[PDB]
Amino acid sequence: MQIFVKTLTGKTITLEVEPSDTIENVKAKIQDKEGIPPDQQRLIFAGKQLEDGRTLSDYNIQKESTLHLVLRLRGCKXX
Amino acid sequence: XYXXXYX
Ligand SMILES: *[C@@H]1O[C@H](CO)[C@@H](O)[C@H](O)[C@H]1NC(=O)CCCCCCC(C)C
Ligand SMILES: *[C@@H]1O[C@H](CO)[C@@H](O)[C@H](O)[C@H]1NC(C)=O
Ligand SMILES: *[C@H]1O[C@H](CO)[C@@H](O)[C@H](O)[C@@H]1O
């Protein structure tokens, strides 16, 4: 299946993934198309901050879906 | 504090 990653810049990027690929694999697929470090990406979808270790199927993300690439928010919980 | 996170 194919998904889309819309960003703050407003540039939609066409990614080609599989139901088995983990979220982190998706983030890394962007590092191959653009060069953006995966450790600096935060994919938002359906008002949810998608976790790294979890496939697409877990989120029921269906064909032709659109995610949001924002920048990782430095948490304030911890210290 | 004295450890990290982030939780
Ligand atoms: C810890 O993270 C907070 C944000 O979540 C910051 O506001 C805070 O200033 C940070 N304190 C730090 O000390 C960051 C790490 C500094 C280097 C620590 C090196 C270790 C001790 C080897
Ligand atoms: C801190 O942990 C929170 C947990 O909600 C996370 O959202 C955030 O990305 C983390 N910040 C880091 C790893 O700097
Ligand atoms: C944040 O809170 C958790 C609670 O289990 C701690 O385990 C962690 O070390 C930190 O204090």
Side-chain angles (χ1 to χ4, degrees):
Chain A
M1 50 175 290
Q2 181 180 181
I3 64 182
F4 304 96
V5 183
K6 196 175 184 182
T7 185
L8 317 182
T9 307
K11 314 313 174 183
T12 298
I13 308 309
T14 58
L15 281 63
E16 207 68 7
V17 292
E18 291 284 342
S20 55
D21 288 327
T22 59
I23 291 300
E24 188 174 354
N25 289 17
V26 173
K27 294 185 177 183
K29 286 184 176 297
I30 302 180
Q31 183 183 8
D32 296 331
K33 301 303 182 61
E34 301 308 330
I36 317 175
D39 43 301
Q40 306 183 14
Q41 309 176 11
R42 266 302 178 179
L43 297 181
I44 306 180
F45 180 77
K48 287 190 174 183
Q49 189 65 256
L50 285 55
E51 184 185 89
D52 307 324
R54 211 128 65 182
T55 64
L56 298 170
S57 58
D58 291 24
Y59 298 95
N60 190 31
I61 303 176
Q62 191 61 20
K63 177 191 173 185
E64 309 299 350
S65 57
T66 300
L67 291 63
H68 295 269
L69 175 59
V70 301
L71 57 80
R72 180 105 58 83
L73 254 172
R74 151 148 289 205
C76 227
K77 291 185 175 62
Chain B
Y2 295 85
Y6 298 85

